[PDB]
Symmetry: C3
Subunit: 258 residues, 3 copies
């Protein structure tokens, strides 16, 4: 008997498709999912799946992410659902999770092929930027008044690192920091990147206008030099996915194309 | 002749379906509406209905909510549209409105049945939690930097009350208060609940990360103990609906299941 | 050979339809577009179009807006794409752009007709309000804690001006200002208008509740008198469109109907 697997996020569902694995559950989402799962039961929001639906499906494994573990682990345990929280905070961690899914579900060849493809794409960006002069970068996540600083330990920080950017924040131990803006202004990043995950682009544009008028950020050289980018929310999520090669290539354009 | 009724919100439209009433107008919404109204004219945003469409429909009654009365009453009066603003700030108030709609539109039996079902569900939660030790709860509505404190006088406060939670805010007269965070930290709620009505879950997750880094909230015991929940926006609206029994059951899980 | 044109926003696509021009590219959007372009290739977000798709289409011209020029100009130049950034910061500027598109693409008669219709609608509002006593107005764009003041130099400021409103901000040179709220309170606008472009109405309602509790705004007479309006985001965009006649008529209702 094939294992009965519930995937609770779009990113995991895409990995399951590349691994040629059937699913009994998929997340409820407005995003397009692989066609093979067109008729699979939806199990609610990735950020809070519907435990009663999932229980009914009697799965052998429910797949979520490390970043959601604190939020969802108790509910799964309470419902007697076996669950695996995959670490998608870097591309490398995602690739190890892909390897481990191959081993867990008898798809070692498919996982190996997928990782080979990813690594080839990543290696090409690394090679492309290796001899370039590197810009310093400040990564912000959030909305006006509450921006978090994103370190190398989060996925968007990993993309900046792999594309050769030098994060203005160093030697930190957390994924997201509260912004110390006077310190950041003195550090003077060459480039500022912003992510408002899930937010409509029209709202993000409004935020862009606010940033330019704000004493808090307007005297940064990056603002004066028009080196502030909004990361396409549709392509740059908070955690890793198969979108990474495309995301890394877009990152390379922003860091060096100007 | 049947009365010509315009329902301007999803919640009211669902009540009209349970009352077996025809409609000449429904709100414009991306949410699924009862199938019987598939071909009914849409009348614009619940938060600002299209008065020119509604006028054309020559309704006998337009139904909105108390919470929107201040915003919409003048427009309706100016357009010579008769309108009823239903109080959905508690389940009990919603049930009285259901009774009154039954009387107004000759659906007393249907309203009585609907209220019987609701009351049976509510009574079961009350019975379930009656002998449990009760946690203190802080309810926040909004986005980083501008969270409102939600009292017992608003619908989400009513759900907390009915599920046995003790609001840290007492003896207030308003539905929403400005947050006095130092006071709230000293009150030390066992649990913090957050609602960002209408906001995509992916954005809410981002807010969750910001909350944990913010000096303003991070030293609350509830944060240290991982007792902060985001209320599923799709299920917990700002005002009451037929979703209430499901919402109350989910509330009971959060307050006691941990 | 007909020119190969890519329209990167909904507003421009609607103008191209009125000008009876074929398109090779349209923006990717959830909004309804003119039916004649049902099968036209989508080219990504208006706020960051997909340059690789657009390159493939080998267009003669890519159309965007002045307000996006700073963000998008370098990418287009880098991709060797000819691009025109149309000034939609007022109705009059939009009408000059319509005239110039007619000349550029051999649609002078169609552009002239479209502008005649627009001007007739605008003239009617101007005539309607000419002898009315004019209210002072404060226009805010954004979200709690980060509202920008909108001047006459931005499109929503232009609508207020044309409908007879007197902006409390005068003799400015920029489209958007940081809010000096103590100054604004002393200026005491008769009416406050708010725009959260792209934001779901349910979120905007939540913001409305927050505004009323905020010491920063609650002592304005406009708040005390219930003269604060949320501009329907679906109809009042950040920059001009063919929606303007409808928008101007709704503006006239808010400024004088009360
Ligand atoms: Cl993760
Ligand atoms: Cl209400
Ligand atoms: Cl513009």
């Amino acid at each position: 008997k094939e294992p009965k697997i519930v995937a609770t996020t779009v990113a995991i569902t895409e990995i399951m498709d590349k691994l040629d694995l059937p699913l009994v559950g998929i997340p409820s989402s407005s995003k397009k999912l692989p066609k093979r799962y067109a008729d699979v039961k939806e199990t609610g929001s990735p950020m809070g799946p519907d435990l009663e639906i999932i229980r009914m499906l009697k799965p052998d494994m429910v797949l979520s992410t490390k970043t959601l573990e604190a939020d969802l682990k108790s509910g799964f345990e309470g419902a007697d659902l076996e669950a695996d929280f995959l670490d998608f905070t870097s591309i490398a961690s995602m690739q190890t999770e892909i390897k481990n899914l191959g081993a867990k579900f008898d798809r070692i060849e498919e996982a190996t092929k997928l990782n080979k493809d990813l690594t080839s794409d990543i290696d090409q960006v690394k090679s492309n930027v290796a001899k370039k002069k590197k810009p310093t970068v400040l990564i912000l996540m959030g909305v006006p008044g509450s921006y978090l600083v994103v370190t190398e330990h989060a996925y968007i920080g990993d993309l900046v690192k792999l594309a050769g950017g030098e994060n203005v924040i160093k030697d930190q131990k957390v994924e997201y920091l509260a912004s110390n803006t006077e310190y950041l202004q003195s550090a003077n990043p060459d480039i500022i990147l912003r992510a408002a995950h899930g937010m409509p682009a029209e709202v993000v544009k409004m935020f862009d206008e606010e940033f330019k008028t704000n004493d808090i950020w307007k005297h940064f050289d990056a603002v004066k030099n028009n080196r502030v980018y909004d990361l396409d929310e549709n392509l740059f999520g908070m955690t890793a996915s198969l979108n990474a090669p495309e995301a890394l290539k877009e990152m390379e354009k922003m860091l060096y194309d100007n």
